[PDB]
Design a protein around this nucleic acid. Structure first.
Ligand SMILES: [Ca+2]
Ligand SMILES: [Ca+2]
Ligand SMILES: [Ca+2]
Ligand SMILES: [Ca+2]
Ligand SMILES: [Ca+2]
Ligand SMILES: [Ca+2]
Ligand SMILES: [K+]
Ligand SMILES: [K+]
Lengths: 98, 79, 105, 96, 96, 105, 98, 79
DNA sequence: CGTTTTTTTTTTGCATGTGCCGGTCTCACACGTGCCTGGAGACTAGTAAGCGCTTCTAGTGGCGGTTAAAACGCGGTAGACAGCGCGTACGTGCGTTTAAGCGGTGCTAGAGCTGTCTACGACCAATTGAGCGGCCTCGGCACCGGGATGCTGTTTTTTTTTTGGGTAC
DNA sequence: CCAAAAAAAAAACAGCATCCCGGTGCCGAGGCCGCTCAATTGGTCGTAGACAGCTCTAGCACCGCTTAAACGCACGTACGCGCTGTCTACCGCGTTTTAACCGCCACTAGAAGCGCTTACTAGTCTCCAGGCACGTGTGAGACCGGCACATGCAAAAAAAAAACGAGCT
């Protein structure tokens, strides 16, 4: 009755995705978020297919890099688990928030 | 609320690419908040570039130009 | 048999650059050497990345360089990674890199 | 139609065959390489421009392009680049 | 005599007196206010400069200065700044 | 002859601004609205700082604005702080701020 | 004889220097260091006094800002002492450092 | 020991403005290294400007142009 | 020195992923082709800027006294940090549910291109007042001493928590 | 429960720093003046871009399968974190030493300004091939078997390192 210990699969997932370059958000739910966010500014707005791709490439790139930094913050607190305050410190030092 | 379409499993995968091994339960709602602002701050400028060119279609170049202003230059969409 | 590129010994169009310089609202007047010097630097930096990208390709048993090869080439090099420290390369992923403390004993 | 959209991708292929003659390039990779040359064109051209304006000169010369490259490229990259660019200027002012 | 060093300092003083008639300003505080006008000048001008080149147009119009200001200035600053510009132009177009 | 700035209702030199736009290598041609609009915006932003900066100076019991007043003005306004978030104001010091965890119990 | 508890003066010193705007590095030493570091790029160089003051206003600003971001890293690790690893994390997240 | 001319008490003052309450003894030397790498990166560019202008005197504007490049724009010395 | 326990450490035992061969099928890199527009050319004309020559700004160096700042050492508290111990918040792994992803069709907004035509801004010369450098003055503000006030720390006393007996299952 | 020992709480008390006031004196903000060059005016000419009309690209909607991925629940391990406890690094303040600071004078490097002169680049009209779009081919690479193979965990193998005689000096 097999059971990998907590954090064994995680290290595999880290290894797996760090190897690859595929977008890790499902494209339709993302596109919908773009158009929703867009609506606020200007209504009846069309998007090039590439434009929504450029925006997901970006959004993901950004979030991976924040988790990088957010992780170092968790390690600095002698933890291994990233928590909201980890993100908040990453972004306050980055200059993205006051 | 298409933000919820940004699923826990998807956030975990981004986190994993970001070398993260363990993850608080509060991070998924946090991460969504940060994402929304990022897309707001980029799109707002993208759509401004759309409006000035007098179009009804946001082009990739619009996004490229916006991302460059947010100090997040993006290669391979018309850079 | 002549062309401003081949007189300077380049693959980058010294002509194209001289026109981009005039038309790109940088200065009233453009010196004849400027587009030569520039084409050279753009060529030299393109060579530098291709060299290392094709060393990451040939290291995957790949005939064709893809985005990931370019990224790998640029991030593992300290100087290139600096020059492009604020650039995102799309379909480029991130260097395999796990913090020692997260490993098992 | 389809405009007539100019690129760098031939002058990239004409350098890829010179360094690594066996191996080629996908479109997305050639796109990232086109972005690259355009970025750095602008960075150098832009700094040269300021360099000129600060010194009350009306002309961007190979000298402005040089100082600009000293400011923009890191340690070794900035030396090699200066050379290749000094090299190319000399061989051009030879060739008439 | 010394050569002519231009400055925005006579107009800063004018605006200051409009807003605080009984308030002065140190030489340094004036130098900061100068750095400021030139900074934002360059920022708007350059962002307009780009907008024009991006839309294949030879002319920086008031419309470029506007879009540039909506890109650069945060929230309420952009709205108010945009109004003040839009007023200023209208009034200038009426008097000729 | 009466100045463009007089016509447009501004304190800022429309004339000067027009010249700086031609001489700054921004575009081939400069419209007639452009310098008026740009002058207005620079005046508006100049007003906003000197407004708050004045209030800063009054709260010190000082007649004349000094760099610190400008700094107190800018760093305490959320939007002016964001506009000048990558800008160092000589002789301005920093806002009084002590992390709660550092005060005695 | 009267004696202040450890850090009561520190708090006082913080309040003192957050209130004031004077350069906190002694001018002559700093100027020597400016000249020293210049000789690495070119010999027999002269400096406008403003050019030296510009550099000192810049360094002092940078360092105060860095100490702010450092101090946050220290508190994040449930400490009150800044240590080299608070400065290293700070500069890493800023992207000054690899 | 020009770098030491940046005394322990000077650095300690800078940190107090930074609102630091307590300071490891290792900070002072660490701080000296950060400061050296800061002036090196500015004075480098600063001087590159002086050179290109064919001058033997470094001008405030050279410094100002250098700081703007390093993303550390400074107000009240020209520009 | 041996002789009981424990506390560490070594080697199996399966169960899960990647890592790797062989085919092998598609679509996108590659190259060829023909045609258009952007680079090339030789010309004239003007002026941008290199150079040489003059001005005098302000950067450099030195000196000697004052005193604030750095230094260095003594002492002790309060913080870093290591260990322990407890409660559940996360990770794993199923079985169930969802809707993204795929390939395809059908409709048309609007992206994008062309040609035409003129309102607008560049360029020009004359005109002149706004804004500059230089110069003068006088009150704001830096500096100082003196007294009021607020905040700290110590020692004493009070208040509650907290902790080591004295009987019960 | 009983009772005693701390650990916090409140209290009074001396003390040191900080803050506020009026007084003094210096200099830099402020404003005035006279000259200068940059903005204004009014004129002519060219073309950038506004607009109308036409092409057709690709963005949108919709549909219907096939999974791959999301979701939800069960269960338990390993982590986050609160508590305690120990060692000294770092803070405070004192006495001793240093050199920054200031004001000043003397010297001249070189910043900066002006005038001349010509080599260099912008502008123009003519030519044409390099580089474009478009379109077809063909081999790289992604896909899909199964087959070593490495791992990595559930332990039992044994094998070291402690807890306790040991029994003698
Ligand atoms: Ca094969
Ligand atoms: Ca249209
Ligand atoms: Ca006058
Ligand atoms: Ca051909
Ligand atoms: Ca082939
Ligand atoms: Ca397979
Ligand atoms: K000088
Ligand atoms: K006065």
């Amino acid at each position: 009755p097999h059971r990998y210990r907590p954090g064994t699969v995680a290290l595999r997932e880290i290894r797996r995705y760090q190897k690859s370059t595929e977008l890790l958000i499902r494209k339709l739910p993302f596109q919908r978020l773009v158009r929703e966010i867009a609506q606020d500014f200007k209504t009846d707005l069309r998007f090039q297919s590439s434009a929504v791709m450029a925006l997901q490439e970006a959004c993901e790139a950004y979030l991976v890099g924040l988790f990088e930094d957010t992780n170092l913050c968790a390690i600095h607190a002698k933890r291994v688990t990233i928590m909201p305050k980890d993100i908040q410190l990453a972004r306050r030092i980055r200059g993205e928030r006051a | 609320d298409n933000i919820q379409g940004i699923t826990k499993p998807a956030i975990r995968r981004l986190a994993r690419r970001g070398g993260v091994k363990r993850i608080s339960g509060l991070i998924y709602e946090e991460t969504r908040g940060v994402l929304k602002v990022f897309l707001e701050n980029v799109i707002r400028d993208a759509v401004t570039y759309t409006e000035h060119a007098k179009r009804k279609t946001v082009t990739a170049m619009d996004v490229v130009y916006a991302l460059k202003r947010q100090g997040r230059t993006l290669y391979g969409f018309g850079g | 048999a002549k062309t401003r590129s081949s007189r300077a010994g380049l693959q980058f169009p010294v002509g194209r650059v001289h026109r981009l310089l005039r038309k790109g609202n940088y200065s009233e007047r453009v010196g004849a050497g400027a587009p030569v010097y520039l084409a050279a630097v753009l060529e030299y930096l393109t060579a530098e990345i291709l060299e290392l990208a094709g060393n990451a390709a040939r290291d995957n048993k790949k005939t064709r360089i893809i985005p990931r090869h370019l990224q790998l080439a640029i991030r593992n090099d300290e100087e290139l990674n600096k020059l492009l420290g604020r650039v995102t390369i799309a379909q480029g992923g991130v260097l395999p890199n796990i913090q020692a403390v997260l490993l098992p004993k | 139609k389809r405009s007539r959209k100019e690129s760098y991708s031939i002058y990239v292929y004409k350098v890829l065959k010179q360094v690594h003659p066996d191996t080629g390039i996908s479109s997305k990779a050639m796109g990232i390489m086109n972005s690259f040359v355009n970025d750095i064109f602008e960075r150098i051209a832009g700094e040269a421009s300021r360099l000129a304006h600060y010194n009350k000169r009306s002309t961007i010369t190979s000298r402005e392009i040089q100082t600009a490259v000293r400011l923009l490229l890191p340690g070794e990259l900035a030396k090699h680049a200066v050379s290749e660019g000094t090299k190319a200027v000399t061989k051009y002012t030879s060739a008439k």
